[PDB]
Amino acid sequence: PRAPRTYSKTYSTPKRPYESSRLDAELKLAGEFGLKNKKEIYRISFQLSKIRRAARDLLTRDEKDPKRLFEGNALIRRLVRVGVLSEDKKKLDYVLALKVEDFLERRLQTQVYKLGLAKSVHHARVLITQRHIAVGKQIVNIPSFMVRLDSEKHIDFAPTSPFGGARPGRVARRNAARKAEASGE
């Protein structure tokens, strides 16, 4: 005796999911950025398509029309908040010209590897899901965080980790126990 609960499929699906071009595309992207799922790639590209299509129609609309102007500044402000569009090309032509590889760059773990706290994308992945890195206060563990500028200047370690902080973890403290054991037995 309530309302229907809210839900919606948050990704779309390509029209030719088996083709050499699209397949090698997904191969090269997923290998260069350490992914595992066609779901991840297709979902990012779907959200991009939504953004780009709405911006397309609102660029076809006429100039000096507050609908076009206000909606365009809304989407440009969203994108400059995210960081994927530059500050100086703030135009509808450049939200159109944006594409997938920029978002695959501005994904979080990508920034971890570029900044070089770990020397592999896969090291970055296992580090984030083993809970060692935080921007500011909360320690994130979803490697699809979509980090903006206001945090990308603040990606940091965990000061409760035994990496950048406190007492040894599980294996190092067991090895400490058993070197003490080898010391005292």
Binding site: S49, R52, R53, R56, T60, D93, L96, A97, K99
Partner: protein
């Protein structure tokens, strides 16, 4: 950058799709249409029945 041919222009006018807006419709981004001089001459040597399609395909948006 796209290359337009005689069959493309023909079926474009037979289905009433304006060129650049139809291109933005297809590609979802910014794109420029180009035709070559050989293609222009091909339409020309097709000739007098398709002169309206010729006057269309010659438009100073098409570099």
């Amino acid at each position: 950058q796209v290359l337009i041919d005689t069959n493309f222009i023909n079926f474009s006018i037979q289905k009433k799709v304006d060129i650049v807006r139809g291109m933005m419709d297809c590609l979802l981004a910014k794109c420029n249409p180009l035709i070559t001089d050989c293609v222009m001459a091909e339409l020309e040597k097709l000739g007098p029945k398709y002169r309206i399609a010729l006057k269309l395909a010659r438009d100073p948006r098409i570099k």
